[PDB]
């Protein structure tokens with residue numbers, strides 16, 4: 567029912583989910599006062615993506631869609647936003663078990679079962695335009711980290727699972743964006759063609775799904791969308807911002823069989839530039855960051871359908887507790903804010919950092 571032509575971000579308004587709002591209102595605001603407290607309330611109204619990082623999270627997707635249907639009945643013209651993120655052997659670059667499913671233990675079949683639940687929900691809510699980011703930090707690893715055994719070994723499963731997801735969720739009311747890393751990852755000249763080739767193959771191998779509108783970039787990262795001066799940590803890379811990245815890989819996708827591919831770029835933590843990153847590859851709770859460009863389709867650039875907030879600012883990227891099961895050394899680096907909770911959990915000091923260094927400002 568909620569069909570569309572062209573940019574799926576035009577004609578609708580991204581829904582600011584209750585999940586994130588609860589975090590800010592119940593875990594953050596009670597700790598703030600005056601200006602900060604009032605500004606914080608505003609942050610909760612900015613639409614961000616809901617991550618379906620576990621099967622147990624799927625019922626939350628239906629609830630969100632239920633809320634949206636109710637709102638749309640009242641003049642609402644809202645669209646849901648979700649991230650498909652539960653591949654077996656997820657985040658293959660990290661040694662420890664990151665997700666609930668593993669290839670060795672029927673992971674691929676379990677992934678398909680996971681996708682089946684999501685399809686049924688989307689079919690039931692075909693009246694709601696659904697914008698999805700497909701598996702962040704998966705395909706990019708296949709381009710650069712095959713040197714890591716866990717990734718090399720996961721290649722086959724990743725491609726089969728992603729194909730299932732893209733074909734099963736190829737519905738009239740859906741717009742999918744395949745995660746494509748970011749400028750400091752696949753933006754480097756040397757990685758551009760191999761990346762473009764892989765993405766185009768995924769598209770074609772899925773029979774050029776109508777719903778697969780393009781690629782998502784900078785998900786959970788901090789690059790600027792259009793900064794004018796190269797940060798020191800970008801040394802050597804001419805593609806030092808997301809705009810440069812999408813303009814470099816876009817034509818290449820076409821050369822490899824994928825025309826009319828558009829993009830969406832995360833700017834949820836890109837507001838302060840340069841960042842406090844001492845190394846471009848440092849991705850955990852980076853210090854010196856702020857909320858960035860607000861979600862909007864008025865990008866002024868043909869290739870970008872919209873600025874978006876995929877990674878919800880305030881939700882931790884990983885714990886700094888060295889004895890924690892999924893501890894990652896990247897979260898204990900000097901350019902990473904500490905002490906930090908487990909991935910996904912609320913990290914108050916980080917939320918305050920983002921709010922404080924926000925541009926546009928909330929204060």
Ligand SMILES: *[C@@H]1O[C@H](CO)[C@@H](O)[C@H](O)[C@H]1NC(C)=O
Pocket residue numbers: 722725726729767768771772
């Ligand atoms: C194409 O789809 C099949 C699913 O049958 C998958 O196993 C394969 O890895 C995919 N190939 C590419 C290049 O995506």
Ligand SMILES: *[C@@H]1O[C@H](CO)[C@@H](O)[C@H](O)[C@H]1NC(C)=O
Pocket residue numbers: 791792794859864865866
């Ligand atoms: C970057 O994009 C933002 C949002 O569209 C805009 O406000 C800003 O002027 C742009 N910066 C440059 C240098 O074009």
Ligand SMILES: *[C@H]1O[C@H](CO)[C@@H](O)[C@H](O)[C@@H]1O
Pocket residue numbers: 568569570571
């Ligand atoms: C999908 O189809 C509907 C009509 O069923 C249109 O109104 C919409 O613009 C899109 O083409």
Ligand SMILES: *[C@H]1O[C@H](CO)[C@@H](O)[C@H](O)[C@@H]1O
Pocket residue numbers: 577578579580642643644
């Ligand atoms: C989605 O909702 C917003 C808020 O009402 C509108 O401004 C927009 O035009 C669209 O209907």
Ligand SMILES: *[C@H]1O[C@H](CO)[C@@H](O)[C@H](O)[C@@H]1O
Pocket residue numbers: 584585586588589592593
């Ligand atoms: C609203 O929802 C958030 C996210 O689960 C919780 O952290 C909060 O306690 C409240 O239940």
Ligand SMILES: *[C@H]1O[C@H](CO)[C@@H](O)[C@H](O)[C@@H]1O
Pocket residue numbers: 587588590591592607608610611
């Ligand atoms: C959480 O709830 C508070 C209190 O209503 C709001 O101010 C905030 O915007 C968010 O919805």
Ligand SMILES: *[C@H]1O[C@H](CO)[C@@H](O)[C@H](O)[C@@H]1O
Pocket residue numbers: 588589591592593
């Ligand atoms: C955050 O969560 C609390 C419960 O812990 C609610 O009372 C509040 O309204 C918000 O949802």
Ligand SMILES: *[C@H]1O[C@H](CO)[C@@H](O)[C@H](O)[C@@H]1O
Pocket residue numbers: 593594596597598914
């Ligand atoms: C909000 O932040 C304060 C500290 O600023 C905490 O004491 C509180 O428990 C909540 O995390």
Ligand SMILES: *[C@H]1O[C@H](CO)[C@@H](O)[C@H](O)[C@@H]1O
Pocket residue numbers: 599600601603604605
């Ligand atoms: C921010 O401003 C609001 C009113 O706009 C106050 O209610 C709040 O206490 C804080 O000062």
Ligand SMILES: [Co+2]
Pocket residue numbers: 628
């Ligand atoms: Co139901």
